[PDB]
Amino acid sequence: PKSMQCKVILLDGSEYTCDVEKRSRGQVLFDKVCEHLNLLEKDYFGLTYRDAENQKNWLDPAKEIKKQVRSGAWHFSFNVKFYPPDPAQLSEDITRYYLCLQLRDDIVSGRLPCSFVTLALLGSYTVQSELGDYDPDECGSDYISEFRFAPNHTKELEDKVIELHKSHRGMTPAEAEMHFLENAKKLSMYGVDLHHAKDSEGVEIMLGVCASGLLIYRDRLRINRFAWPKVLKISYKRNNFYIKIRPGEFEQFESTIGFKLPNHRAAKRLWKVCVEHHTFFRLL
């Protein structure tokens, strides 16, 4: 029975290696990575791989791994797939921990923009969780943390992390991680999966996929949102993505809104993440 080596980048930046039978479905690998991570609240997570166009795709747990990675390496990342709007409601501290590690990468990468003060506050909770109480012996006036807090670091930011870390004396790791999440969850781009697109006129927009629906970003002064319950049908055709909206009260007809994606694979990918968000946040 022939086995394929799998390499998975974990949220702490380390690498998990295992073997699965070459006909294995995605769920087999996911279950192995989740066991390794001691993670029981698996529904919020998944594995990503890079396609031949170097685009991130979600590994479908129901489909054969080989029919997704196709010509590419069996190389994956472990990631948050569904960002919970209220992380306090997760049943385990270890779930909140992985969510924090994902959000730290979202912030450092610039996927989750964040004010100076919120970067420093998030940083201060990370430092408290990982080192415990502020110690003046480890940090002089010239201290720079090993921790990555932001896409660009300044001495001012390092200073403010320390000033806020001082305030958290006595705080336990689960407590600091819960505070991290109570602040992170409020950021306007929290758990927003962004896709480049054009509207029906050819104007360049971003489409955001998240718990609260499909968001349209254009010019930063005109932001439309379609809550999931309003969306009856999501479809794609060639390079086009379509959402069918419920008729408003006393309106005779549903309305269908159309967008242009870079290519057919980009349209299908946006369709799949929308259907998955629609199902997940209908049930959560």
Contact footprint for ligand WHV (CB under 6 A): 43, 276, 279-280, 283
Please, what is the minimum distance in Å from the beta carbon of residue 195 to ligand WHV?
A: 17
Q: Which residue number, 123 or 208, has a Cβ lying nearer to ligand WHV?
A: 208
Q: Which residue number, 175 or 276, has a Cβ lying nearer to ligand WHV?
A: 276
Torsion angle of alpha carbons 88, 89, 90, 94, nearest 10°?
30
226: left (phi over 0), alpha (psi -120 to 50) or beta: beta
Q: How far apart are CA 60 and CA 31, in angstroms?
A: 13
Return all residues near 41 (Cβ < 8 A) that are at least 6 apart: 90, 91, 92, 95
Please, what is the minimum distance in Å from the beta carbon of residue 28 to ligand WHV?
A: 16
Please, what is the minimum distance in Å from the beta carbon of residue 158 to ligand WHV?
A: 39
Q: Which residue number, 149 or 241, has a Cβ lying nearer to ligand WHV?
A: 241
Q: Which residue number, 30 or 125, has a Cβ lying nearer to ligand WHV?
A: 30
Q: How far apart are CA 106 and CA 240, in angstroms?
A: 28
Structure tokens at 261: 């994606």
Q: Which residue number, 221 or 283, has a Cβ lying nearer to ligand WHV?
A: 283
Q: Which residue number, 196 or 282, has a Cβ lying nearer to ligand WHV?
A: 282
Please, what is the minimum distance in Å from the beta carbon of residue 43 to ligand WHV?
A: 4
Please, what is the minimum distance in Å from the beta carbon of residue 62 to ligand WHV?
A: 10
Please, what is the minimum distance in Å from the beta carbon of residue 283 to ligand WHV?
A: 5
214: left (phi over 0), alpha (psi -120 to 50) or beta: beta
- When CB distances to ligand WHV are compared, the closest residue is 276
Q: Which residue number, 44 or 180, has a Cβ lying nearer to ligand WHV?
A: 44
Angle between helices 155-166 and 116-131 (to 10 degrees): 60
Q: How far apart are CA 17 and CA 212, in angstroms?
A: 36
Please, what is the minimum distance in Å from the beta carbon of residue 218 to ligand WHV?
A: 28
Select from 220, 222, 215, 223 the least CA-distant residue to 274.
215
